[PDB]
Symmetry: D6
Subunit: 166 residues, 12 copies
């Protein structure tokens, strides 16, 4: 049984470890962190800020990933979604599950109108997870991110609640 | 033997767990929380605020629920009542007991004039608990709450101390 | 030319004066005030709280009233509306104007789903202003407010954006 | 035209002067003060405390006195009333007016059940003002106050809202 | 061997428990508390305030009660006395002892002139403990306290040091 | 002679006025403001935050607009540009000038790689100013902004420094 | 007409000047000061401390001196009295007046049992003012104060309220 | 082997216990305390204040008492000495030792000119300890202390360094 | 008569203006500023930091420039020198004077061993001012600074006190 | 397997020990430290400052060194690199590895343009590690550092990303 | 008529100016200052520190100098004296006067045992002022101060109160 | 193997004990302490103050002493040295070692010009340790320190780096 659970202070080591698996710099409420000690301090600084919301993805046996809703805007009713699954659990349907649940949370709980994400235009496996959840490409943002010594293009993809309920 | 006991800091894990059993977002002194860590911080922020009062419902063996009096107003002498019983204990009369005791607390201890609540107009089992304690419907508030992807209607129900003592 | 303008610190004397024209106790972010000095201190305490929003109603010559949106909830997308016009300006269409503009602000700017208000069930002139803006009665809340030595009944009235655009 | 007006920070010099006309030590939220500078600092410390409420008594031309409701208790619904009129205005009906208005405020606005006061058992002129407003003696508290080198007896007098409305 | 001992932080659980045996709301330096967690926070806030003084009543084996001197006034030299003995120890002379010692403390240590108390006019067993220590009734304060759904009358009783030493 | 000048505290009234000319809600370091008093407080809170940079556009006679660089990211080296010219000065080349200077500042001073903006897909006059400065459309973000009661589509447009220097 | 008036913040220049007329170091709540700037800062630090109480001695035309009650002890009910009259006003009866009034304040207002003072055993003119108010010598404290390069003896003198009322 | 050792935070329980053996109220830097919890808080408040200095009197086996130098004045070079020995150790020469050492500390380390003390004029055993260390009576301060229901006379006794070295 | 004077708070407008004459970003204690309002806040933050020292260069009629010693290191005894003269005063010998005086201050007052600076390798007029004061080139730091859209090379130049005194 | 890992609070003992192996004084965000206790306090003060970034160099068995990027400048895009390897691990290729990884981090992650370092002109073994990573000497800074009683010359060496990718 | 007056906050401009007449760096409570703005901030930081004491030297017409007692030690009873007279007033006997008065203050008011000073061994005019007040040389501290590019020798001179009174 | 190690927080008990072996009062950054609890609080207050520097003297088996450099002045480049060795380790060469190392630290690491000390003119064993390290007497400061009831003379001794390297 998988589930999404709200992120606690005690989750931050996992968060740190997961993001450490990627060379791209990591942010907590738009402030950068590279260590667990930085992450703990940013966590306490932003503790009641509603612009981001995070969930731990679990099965009964362990924590397997994180769902982040960020740039949550309650006027325009949209937010950016980021999901990271431990790479050792790829293809096991944790990403599909996390997506399904987070989309449901954004639309049916938070009452968002639209959700969007950015994805490296070379990350075919991620794009396919996104596409299977109904995300559509709305933009190709050239040289938008600098990663591993190169500026890379990113797709802006999005999902409208109205498309979601059809 | 059942009893109501004042909520302590050490009760917050139970509070967190109970509210986690419901998809509707949870509030502490009108500030939203989804994690235990948020709940602990809001608890300390509002520690001496008299606008809400909370009790843990117990039997000798465990904690079984929570009674909340909120929006307590000492001029107009009314407050909103919220009671949540662990769903595994339904039909065991904990809800009836919690109600009876909280109404007594509101009227005979706090000196309230009126108590009211909101209930989803589809929640027949809850409405019947309320009706059996003498709550009357005063309003049908259409599309007042957004829950699980739909705007839902709620009854405003209320109990006057004067009706209570008859 | 009438207009709504965002409330500044320098508006608080007017706010104080206006609310002083009514015996019912006045609140700023749910904290009571009776003097300008209390109002100034509550203003600074709640300066960036988004749960209430206030506008000054003006014509070119003077400030004539206040529009308050309170209990703003960005999940359920509803808020309570309060409008007070200086009694010397009654029947001049400032109330109609203030209403029209605040409803527009709530729906088209804030993206609310529903707006509601409470009104003493004897206040026929107010109720008629409300009814002319499309508010419908959803409830009759008996003995809900204590005013001038008596518990008084209030109508809960509301307006759905969906009704508004028809 | 007389009126009661809520006490502002700018009233504190008057408050200081008035209380200075009496040898008995003066208190602000149960903390003693003898100077204006102490009074200003206590005022800011207790600015949002609801246990006391104070009004300035005025005619169109000047401030003539102060009404204080203290030990306000919103559970038992009673409070202690203190009224001081500038001695130069005695017999002009400012005391009667202040009383009438403060009683009305306590009962009909604050929803108190009972109001009480203490008065030196030798202060016949004050007692008669009290008696004319319906206060009844409930106690004779011997040697309760030390004033001008002597312990003096005080009457506890009170007024029930139920008596007030008959 | 019985004794009175000054109240420590570590006594607050006992204090909480004892006051929990009574439906009347409990106060610490005139601020209400219902939980141990509230009591701990009020304790630290008022730690060096001399307006109240509290003692734990003990025998060699356990804590059996609390003595409170409150509203201590060092100008008029009087204070209010409250004593609560665990109901399981009634009739064992702990109340008599606590009284005797607290009166001695108030008069001979604190140099008070007068001590007083309030007691529900129906609480014959308490009144008799008071009367046996020389308290005299000075007032009958009608409908002064709201308890268990009813306004109740209280006696004001008092003891003068001058009577005490005769 | 036109020029760009760094924004001072004393510019905030102009900033407030300018943004007040538009119904879309205004932000300072991603926190919303509608009044000058809110803007002043956010200004002091974010005074040394380098994620946004703002300039006042002037001619010798008056302030005519504002240039904002926001979401400045010094790793990926891109930022979002917002320019607002007083509508009374449209077509006078202040927008062209402001653009030219801000692009120069972003690229040649801040060393950005890319600049981007969002524009309502119906705002032809703005789009043409952008296009004349070399911005290219990279995306069409449907229903991305809620404005005047409707979700509206926005173009994401961008300019690469490499294109700029050709 | 002479009078004693409570010391305000605005009195501190006078206080500074007066004490500057004496080589012995000056104290405010037992902390030393030599300048007005030090005195202002100590004043704010000790603003609500009840261990000292100070009055300005005036005639209708100017401030002529200061009365200080220090080391006020409300258990043992005694305090130390210090009075300084501008030396230009000596023999005019300001010292007698100040004494008379301060003694009255200590005994009849503050309820002190005893007042005492220290005086250089060579200061015959001061001692005679003291003796004329009924102070008696209780001690000769040798080499107790170092003044102008010499250790000097001081009389401890005192007045009992019981002697005062005979 | 006896010795004096500087008082640490961990000594405060002993300090509390010792002072608890006496009915006279106890002070820490002139602020009263009756509990260990009050004593701990006053200790931290006055941690670097040089007006008092305290030592624990020990033998190799236990703490047996406390030496306090208070009202230390570095201009007039005198201080008040207080010594309390556990009553179970009386007559064992701990008081003589503590005295001898504290006098040596005051004169030879702190460079005091004079040391003094107060003693109840009935406390013959204490007076004899004092007299044996060369203290001389300089005053008889009548009704200076209120203890066990009576005002009591105290001797002021003192020792001059010049007498000490003869 | 020229002179160097220590920089005051009131100099910051001049500082702001001067640095505004250059496109390179400006720093105060290594924190960037572009406005006077930022500069004022950084000034107060770093008010007693000894790592930088600044002087205003003046003639009798006006302020003409600024001397900055930064990265002052009191172990290695070296610091970086920056001098900016208003461009309207070039060739008038203010730069020579400022240099001469600041070098004297660094060596003879601060006891530095070495002073150094960085200069754009194209800034011949500056280099010649430096060379005329005895600075020698020690390095050519390629692409060290990004200015006006290009990475530029800088000379590191330095002066040893030992060379200075020859 | 070697790796670089972000520095945590728990790394500071290692950091302290390593720097203790060198007589040159050590800095944390340009503030000097010699003890672990100083280092811990500076660590918390600078916790979110982005001007320095530090990594621990490890193999599977232990921590072997530290990589520091300091004076990070995101406008000019350069930073100073410092690497210290435990001297017991010299010649084992930890320095080469640390270099390779930190250069990669600076260029490909942080997007720096240039990296530089300072090295004592006598430290041939270090210079050779630097030279093997492509650092070139750009300057010889004479008497720039005072170490072990002598002013010593340092090479400024640097690496351009453009050279790095060739 | 000359006099010494205690230094006020408003004296700091004079203090700044006077010390500015000397190249040696200036200190306030051992913290260096070169500007008035630094001096004002140090003044407030050290406002109640008794280790230094300062007086302004005046005649009826203007302030002419400053007397500083520093390193005041109340155990060893000695302090360092610094006197600076405006150089335009040299030879007018202000230095003699300031000395005479400050010595009197140190010995007869502060009860110091010894006063000392340091003086450049070349400053014959100062040394002669010192010698005429009875200062004796106790030491020649070679290369003790670095001034105007040279290490200079200083005399330590001192005056014993015992010599002073002979 | 002996060594000097930087003083940590955990060293303070040793520091306390060592200084306790001497009757002369002890200072931490010129603030007096007699207990470990005072020392801990002063330690945290002065944690980053560079005016004093302290080392623990050790052999492999235990801590044997402390080296203190105080009054460190980085302009005049001199400091005062204090070394205390546990008296049980005298004559074992710990003092010689500590000296040698601290002198080396002051001169070769801190770049001091001169080091000095004070020593009781009767302390021949200390003076000989000093003399053997090249300290020369520059002054005889009579009655400079009050110790064990007597004013004592001290030698000022010093060592110039220039003498040290010969």
């Amino acid at each position: 049984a998988m589930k999404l659970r709200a992120l606690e202070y005690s989750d931050l080591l996992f968060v740190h470890e997961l993001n450490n698996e990627y060379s791209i710099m990591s942010y907590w409420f738009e402030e950068p962190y590279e260590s667990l000690t930085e992450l703990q301090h940013l966590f306490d600084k932003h503790l009641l800020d509603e612009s981001e919301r995070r969930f731990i993805v679990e099965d009964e046996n362990q924590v397997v990933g994180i769902v982040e809703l960020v740039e949550i805007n309650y006027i325009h009713r949209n937010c950016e979604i980021q999901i990271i699954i431990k790479p050792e659990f790829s293809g096991k349907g944790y990403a599909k599950f996390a997506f399904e649940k987070a989309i449901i949370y954004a639309f049916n709980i938070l009452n968002m109108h639209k959700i969007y994400l950015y994805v490296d235009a070379d990350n075919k496996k991620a794009i396919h997870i996104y596409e299977s959840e109904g995300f559509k490409t709305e933009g190709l943002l050239k040289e938008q991110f600098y990663t591993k010594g190169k500026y890379k293009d990113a797709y802006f993809m999005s999902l409208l609640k109205s498309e979601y309920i059809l």
